């Protein structure tokens with residue numbers, strides 16, 4: 001199952017998007033220098049070469065305002081985008097603690113299925129989590145009952161569910177089919193068989209008497 | 214909340230309603246989601262030694 | 263106002279095909295200037311509308327997708343998923359007798375370039 | 378979305394040519410608004426599309442005494458909402474300024490929420506870790522009491538009380 005992971009790789013679009021977004025802001029920031037913003041030219045030396053100071057101060061001030069606005073746009077977006085990568089780094093740090101340094105009961109926080117363990121891998125500007133999960137398979141249907149009556153008393157399972165294979169009843173654990181005989185060491189007693197809806201008759205075996213013959 | 218309150222039972226305090234979490238049911242809203250949280254709340258305490 | 267709206271081009275990628283269809287958003291197909299289909303979302307040109315429903319391939323919008331399956335390009339209503347009834351009864355249970363171990367990936371960004 | 382040309386100039390050729398002296402400001406404006414418009418459909422898929430199958434409840438809507446008819450779809454209403462969802466939905470081209478429709482319609486969200494409801498009533502929490510496994514509801518509630526520190530006999534001897542309290 002771990003071997004199949006390489007086949008699925010040989011995905012990381014979330015990591016390429018971070019690179020793309022910054023490359024696009026740097027390519028745009030440079031391109032915005034070739035704009036006249038309504039001035040006679042876009043080059044602060046050419047203005048002087050063909051114009052007197054009284055009027056050149058106005059033309060250069062227009063270009064300065066335009067390019068200063070470019071920097072304000074750039075920095076504002078970097079702050080808004082840095083908050084998003086920071087929120088992602090907080091999620092990755094939280095999973096590093098809760099998925100890798102321990103076992104989590106949080107649903108879907110550490111993969112799909114029942115969390116067993118996770119292994120980290122380093123990626124460029126990111127982290128990859130290999131989530132190992134427990135998935136049940138191949139179910140069968142059974143008849144069940146909440147309790148069993150014996151000697152006029154209600155017996156409830158300590159852990160597990162009562163199942164019937166068609167002719168006999170057993171106790172099983174809830175996550176894997178593994179039947180055992182219903183005994184007095186497997187169950188506990190509480191109340192009488194007059195309050196439980198759906199209680200059924202069966203035999204609960206006491207180990208004491210067949211030891212005493 | 215959808216995964217941890219509706220598709221399971223949470224032990225996180227106050228995360229899935231006030232009280233001991235039993236279950237949740239989703240409802241749709243025009244631009245959001247409404248959760249119905251079902252909790253267990255004890256009542257009528259007595260004194261003991 | 264004299265009807266206006268954006269124009270978008272739907273393309274499978276030049277490494278798949280060079281065919282394209284165009285949706286004129288909330289434009290009637292009589293006021294735009296083969297396969298012409300009028301939908302409540304605008305005028306769809308270049309795809310045929312079918313009554314079947316498939317898994318989404320090329321997403322157009324408002325529940326409609328296109329695919330290269332049955333080749334030109336088609337417009338169809340998306341399927342939502344498989345359907346399944348749980349065999350519920352008042353005294354029946356289902357318990358697994360076997361299991362598998364699965365591995366899945368999750369990817370998270372942690373940093374940008376410092377400029 | 379906003380068309381920058383119709384906002385700034387508004388069908389004027391003298392202004393439209395002047396926009397060429399400012400560079401690629403409209404390119405930034407379209408990408409900034411489009412990049413956050415795509416996320417809005419992703420936001421709704423991640424909340425509701427958390428189930429692979431579209432689950433249905435049995436016609437015999439009756440679960441150990443619990444009445445769920447106010448949260449399940451009611452086959453006699455606009456589209457297909459529960460009686461409670463009807464309260465939730467009933468209580469709540471200028472010059473370029475365009476509003477785009479969502480990808481998922483309200484009918485499609487209702488169908489995701491009704492499938493989640495059917496799964497948790499008939500299958501508990503098993504459909505989120507594999508195949509949906511049926512178990513009777515009274516027994517689901519007993520497991521859920523065990524998970525908070527209450528023994529299961531406390532539910533089974535008081536089943537009628539808990540169903541009455543839930544329904545009210």
Ligand SMILES: *[C@@H]1O[C@H](CO)[C@@H](O[C@@H]2O[C@H](CO)[C@@H](O)[C@H](O)[C@H]2NC(C)=O)[C@H](O)[C@H]1NC(C)=O
Nearest residue numbers: 142143163164165166167168169170179180181
């Ligand atoms: C249910 O399981 C039981 C136990 O396996 C089956 O009953 C027989 O039980 C006796 C002991 O009391 C064994 O010696 C037999 O070998 C069992 N037979 C079989 C076929 O396993 C019973 O048959 C099972 N019921 C059904 C409907 O399959």
Ligand SMILES: *[C@@H]1O[C@H](CO)[C@@H](O[C@@H]2O[C@H](CO)[C@@H](O)[C@H](O)[C@H]2NC(C)=O)[C@H](O)[C@H]1NC(C)=O
Nearest residue numbers: 144145146197198199351352353354437441513
């Ligand atoms: C589960 O439901 C079925 C009906 O779907 C119940 O079967 C009925 O049982 C009563 C007695 O309680 C009989 O008089 C009816 O004739 C049965 N109906 C059918 C169609 O056979 C069954 O009792 C229920 N189980 C529990 C534990 O309540």
Ligand SMILES: *[C@@H]1O[C@H](CO)[C@@H](O[C@@H]2O[C@H](CO)[C@@H](O)[C@H](O)[C@H]2NC(C)=O)[C@H](O)[C@H]1NC(C)=O
Nearest residue numbers: 148149150151152153193198199200201202203
């Ligand atoms: C389970 O076993 C008990 C004990 O044998 C049954 O209780 C008897 O019920 C019959 C009527 O069906 C009465 O005439 C007897 O007086 C009861 N016996 C006692 C000791 O109270 C009970 O009916 C059985 N349950 C089923 C479903 O057969």
Ligand SMILES: *[C@@H]1O[C@H](CO)[C@@H](O[C@@H]2O[C@H](CO)[C@@H](O)[C@H](O)[C@H]2NC(C)=O)[C@H](O)[C@H]1NC(C)=O
Nearest residue numbers: 232233253254255256257258259260261262527
């Ligand atoms: C348990 O006993 C204590 C006393 O040991 C009770 O305390 C009373 O509290 C009320 C206010 O709630 C005061 O007005 C009384 O003066 C207290 N009584 C005494 C004797 O100090 C407390 O109420 C008892 N708890 C329960 C649940 O009955």
Ligand SMILES: *[C@@H]1O[C@H](CO)[C@@H](O[C@@H]2O[C@H](CO)[C@@H](O)[C@H](O)[C@H]2NC(C)=O)[C@H](O)[C@H]1NC(C)=O
Nearest residue numbers: 001136137138139176177358359360361362363
């Ligand atoms: C549980 O599942 C595994 C397969 O995932 C079963 O193991 C296979 O059993 C067959 C014979 O039935 C062998 O030919 C294969 O070589 C086994 N596979 C492996 C990887 O060992 C296993 O037997 C199943 N358990 C039950 C009780 O059916």
Ligand SMILES: *[C@@H]1O[C@H](CO)[C@@H](O[C@@H]2O[C@H](CO)[C@@H](O)[C@H](O)[C@H]2NC(C)=O)[C@H](O)[C@H]1NC(C)=O
Nearest residue numbers: 438439440442443444445446447448451460544
């Ligand atoms: C579950 O509750 C609903 C109401 O939310 C019950 O429906 C009402 O039933 C009474 C009696 O037939 C009618 O007078 C009302 O008009 C019904 N309300 C609606 C909105 O139709 C329903 O009967 C309950 N189910 C059970 C099994 O008790």
Ligand SMILES: *[C@@H]1O[C@H](CO)[C@@H](O[C@@H]2O[C@H](CO)[C@@H](O)[C@H](O)[C@H]2NC(C)=O)[C@H](O)[C@H]1NC(C)=O
Nearest residue numbers: 255256257535537538539540541542543544545
């Ligand atoms: C536990 O508390 C509930 C109330 O929260 C009690 O149930 C109520 O009892 C009164 C008096 O008999 C009735 O008039 C009400 O109709 C009951 N309410 C409901 C919703 O059924 C219950 O009796 C208490 N349990 C114990 C053992 O005292």
Ligand SMILES: *[C@@H]1O[C@H](CO)[C@@H](O)[C@H](O)[C@H]1NC(C)=O
Nearest residue numbers: 138139140141348349350356
């Ligand atoms: C269990 O029985 C139901 C019908 O009551 C059926 O639909 C389902 O497929 C069965 N499960 C298995 C594993 O056979």
Ligand SMILES: *[C@@H]1O[C@H](CO)[C@@H](O)[C@H](O)[C@H]1NC(C)=O
Nearest residue numbers: 273274275276277278279280
């Ligand atoms: C893209 O083209 C290459 C060949 O240049 C081919 O190997 C690859 O499969 C193509 N990708 C798609 C998605 O068709």
Ligand SMILES: *[C@@H]1O[C@H](CO)[C@@H](O)[C@H](O)[C@H]1NC(C)=O
Nearest residue numbers: 289290291292300301302304
């Ligand atoms: C387009 O106009 C025709 C009449 O010329 C009309 O029949 C049709 O319904 C219109 N389409 C839309 C989508 O309004």
Ligand SMILES: *[C@@H]1O[C@H](CO)[C@@H](O)[C@H](O)[C@H]1NC(C)=O
Nearest residue numbers: 299310311312313314337338
């Ligand atoms: C699709 O079905 C409708 C009836 O529901 C029918 O009127 C329409 O002509 C069908 N479309 C095609 C392309 O056959």
